[PDB]
Amino acid sequence: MRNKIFISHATPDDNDFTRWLALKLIGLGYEVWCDILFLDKGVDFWSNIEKVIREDTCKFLLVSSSYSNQREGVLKELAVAAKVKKQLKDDKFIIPLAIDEQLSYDDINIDIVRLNAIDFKMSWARGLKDILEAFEKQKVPKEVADASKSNLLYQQIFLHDKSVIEKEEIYDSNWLSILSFPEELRFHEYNWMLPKRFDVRELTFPAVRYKNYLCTFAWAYDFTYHLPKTETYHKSKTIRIPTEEILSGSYDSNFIRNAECKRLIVQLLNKAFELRMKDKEVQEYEMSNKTAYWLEKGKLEKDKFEKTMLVGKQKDKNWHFAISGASKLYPFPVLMISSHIFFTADGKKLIDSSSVQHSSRRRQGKNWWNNTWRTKLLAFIKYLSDDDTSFYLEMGSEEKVFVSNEPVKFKGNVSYNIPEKNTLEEEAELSGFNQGEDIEELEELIENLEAE
């Protein structure tokens, strides 16, 4: 029967709350049909409106605003409603929803006869209550008041057509795969041979001191230049244990432990990592504890590589691309890679004050996205790659661990589609929140939590 209450106004111009009105009233137990709600095209919207009006409709709603005046659609629909109410003999057919703030009334029409003067400028609860007793005046056959179908509609109009969908995507991580691994680790017996009262960081080859056993893969005679008295050493004192048993957690005794042998190798890989970077002769910057590795002015063509720019320029400041590396052997024998941005006054000297440094960090980072990080990281890795397969690490005279330059690639089983909002997403979020104690006030403090 006649229980299809209708609405038609400037939907494509101002529809900030038409969906809210429709969902609220259907949750209250009513029935509507609109142009922008359901999956339809605005090429036959007025014809569809006329068709549904002549088939089945009871009441009408119109919203008055500044954008619903300069179009012929509003006036033609008002004339159609006037004709319909004249034919049906209805003295209360349409209801004007006066939402405009700067404008009170612009065009006088005969449509005022079938409506009443209601002001919605101030509040919406009063108007909603009023339209409720408007329904109750003529004993409308209102349906049940349930929000279940309201929700079901909510996953039918407002978004939810672009939600997570089953799609395979390949994700490349920061870890570096290793294919070639040492066969056995050399646990030499030095004791008095190496005196403990010397630092180990200056040693050319990686070495970690543990009581009397030096956990290193280099040959016992490799450390000749730094210590000339290494020639007097018996070969049998070099205790050799395969590393695969340690990785499998099968070699554990009083001499060494599976849970303790893993952490000693990690420092070795890190030490070999700074050895590898200093092989490339790059500039050094200790920030708090972990060093980011970056290339300075006048060392690469066009201050860039491949097809992306690394040593760029922003206003009077020179921004660079820095990479900080680490090693982790718990999940897999792999290498940690991280990215950073540092700023130089003239490309050579560094600012002792980190405040403006992180300020410029945030300034430059708020205008970057996933590509300007992933592509730069990939280019940096390829530049660090020695051969076309996998870069190596230096440990001694014969040891050569090959580390895959290609990052560890995953396969995400869930993904999503980007129909047309690829560009719209970046422009809306350019201006972030930069307030005080109301939204976020310890942003800088959280950034420099590395106070020790």
């Binding site: 909603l128 279940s148 996933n370 995400g412 690829n422 104690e437 006030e441």
Partner: protein
């Protein structure tokens, strides 16, 4: 080449016993859980502050139009979606004179200025609840805009928040904090393209961070989790340095979510131990560990009654057996005790093939039955943007002690993240027990003395 997994997104319970995903949409369509109607809120300020509050109240009564409703839903009026009514008049407030509020405002020391600011705020709040019952149960207090330039920037001339929230626990009197600069987005501007702030582009969100957050302290529950199993406690904890004197004492606290008789989760926060000796351990001795778990046990008894089954104690630092030995005896045999540590010291970043659209939020990288990788920061289609300004960095959730289940504890973290009342954002970067970990730590260190009873989280933050 490895593989990862995805976990289904949990739901939030709304009005009429229904569950939905979006927060602003969910409230704007159904409303809060309960039905409270009589609220006569108050404001502490001056004549200009009174005018600012009246104008902002009139504005929020009026519809709020945003830039794009696709990325962030608008504000469909206050009463029409909250079913609680105020008016322009009929507000019970006791403001202050201009000279009283401006006797000494150029003070650079936050301690001395706040010792009087909080006293002025509370004295004008606790003095009005004795006349008529349930008349002033909500307040919209607004600190002067000069606080915004002399408290957070530490007394500069360009032209803190818990301190008047912590010492009011003795009177059991809530309040909601705002700022004129937060409200007067049209005032204090110039003939510039972007005067001071000028958030004309984002206006509906500013209307959502002010209504739902203030509604919760009105005795009503906005929304809760609809998929929380019966008999689970969380009991988060926070460790950091106190800023009163030397010897930080390693102050501790608690925050636990638990279910009641029926289908309603309790959103409650308790205070336990005082402190422990020496400076750097981020751990507590067994002797004070007895009370920390005993208080939770007894609270669970007298407002629920039956025995629990799983308590997932959350922490940010590594655990130790020095407290587990004491904790294992306190818990009953029928209850399993599991300690979980979540940190942010694992700088992992994932990248896809191509595109400015980033990773989703919810996928997990399982390793073994000790820890996991979960991306709580990323892109969701509802907001049509990345929750972070750069490549997201996931969390590190590990089970220090106990067995539990990785796939089950991961679901708990995702569900516990979407429990933010101070804001109405779709999701936050940290679980609420960790998102508000700093807030609870600082609200406790403001008032270390006076042992508070097992009072609800209504009164914090």
């Amino acid at each position: 080449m490895k593989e990862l997994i995805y976990i289904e997104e949990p739901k939030i319970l709304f009005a009429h016993g229904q569950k939905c995903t979006d927060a602003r949409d969910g409230l704007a369509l159904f409303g809060p859980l309960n039905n409270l109607y009589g609220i006569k809120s108050g404001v502490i300020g001056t004549k200009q502050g009174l005018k600012i509050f009246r104008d902002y109240l009139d504005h929020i009564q009026k519809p709020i139009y945003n830039s794009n409703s696709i990325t962030r839903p608008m504000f469909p009026g206050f009463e029409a979606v909250f079913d609680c009514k105020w008016e322009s008049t009929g507000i019970t407030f006791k403001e202050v004179t201009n000279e009283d509020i401006g006797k000494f405002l150029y003070n650079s020391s936050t301690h001395k200025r706040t010792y009087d600011l909080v006293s002025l705020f509370i004295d004008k709040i606790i003095s009005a609840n004795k006349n008529e019952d349930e008349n002033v149960d909500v307040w919209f207090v607004i600190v002067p805009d000069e606080i915004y330039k002399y408290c957070r920037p530490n007394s500069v001339l360009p032209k803190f928040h818990d301190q008047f929230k912590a010492r009011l626990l003795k009177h059991t009197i809530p309040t909601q904090i705002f700022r004129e600069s937060t409200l007067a987005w049209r005032d204090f501007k110039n003939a510039f393209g972007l005067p001071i702030r000028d958030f004309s582009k984002i206006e509906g969100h500013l209307a959502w961070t002010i209504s739902t957050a203030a509604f919760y302290k009105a005795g009503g529950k906005p929304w809760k989790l609809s998929d929380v199993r019966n008999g689970v406690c969380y009991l988060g904890l926070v460790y950091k340095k106190v800023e009163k004197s030397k010897n930080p004492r390693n102050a501790c606290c608690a925050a636990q979510m638990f279910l009641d008789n029926g289908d309603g989760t309790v959103f409650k926060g308790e205070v336990g131990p005082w402190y422990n000796p020496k400076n750097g351990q981020y751990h507590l001795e067994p002797k004070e560990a007895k009370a920390l778990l005993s208080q939770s046990l007894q609270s669970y008894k007298e407002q629920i009654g039956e025995y629990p089954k799983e308590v997932f104690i959350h922490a940010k630092t590594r655990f130790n057996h020095q407290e587990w030995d004491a904790f294992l005896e306190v818990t009953p045999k029928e209850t399993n005790l599991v300690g979980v540590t979540i940190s942010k010291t694992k700088p992992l970043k994932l990248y896809k093939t191509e595109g400015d659209y980033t990773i989703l939020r919810g996928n997990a990288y399982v390793v073994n039955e000790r820890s996991a990788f979960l991306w709580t920061v990323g892109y969701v289609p509802k907001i049509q943007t990345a929750l972070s300004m750069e490549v997201p960095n996931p969390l590190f959730i590990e089970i220090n002690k106990g067995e539990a289940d990785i796939k089950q504890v991961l679901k708990d973290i995702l569900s516990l993240t979407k429990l933010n009342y101070n804001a109405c954002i779709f999701a936050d970067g940290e679980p609420v027990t960790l998102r508000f970990a700093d807030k609870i730590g600082e609200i406790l260190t403001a008032s270390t003395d006076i042992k508070t009873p097992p009072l609800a989280f209504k009164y914090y933050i």
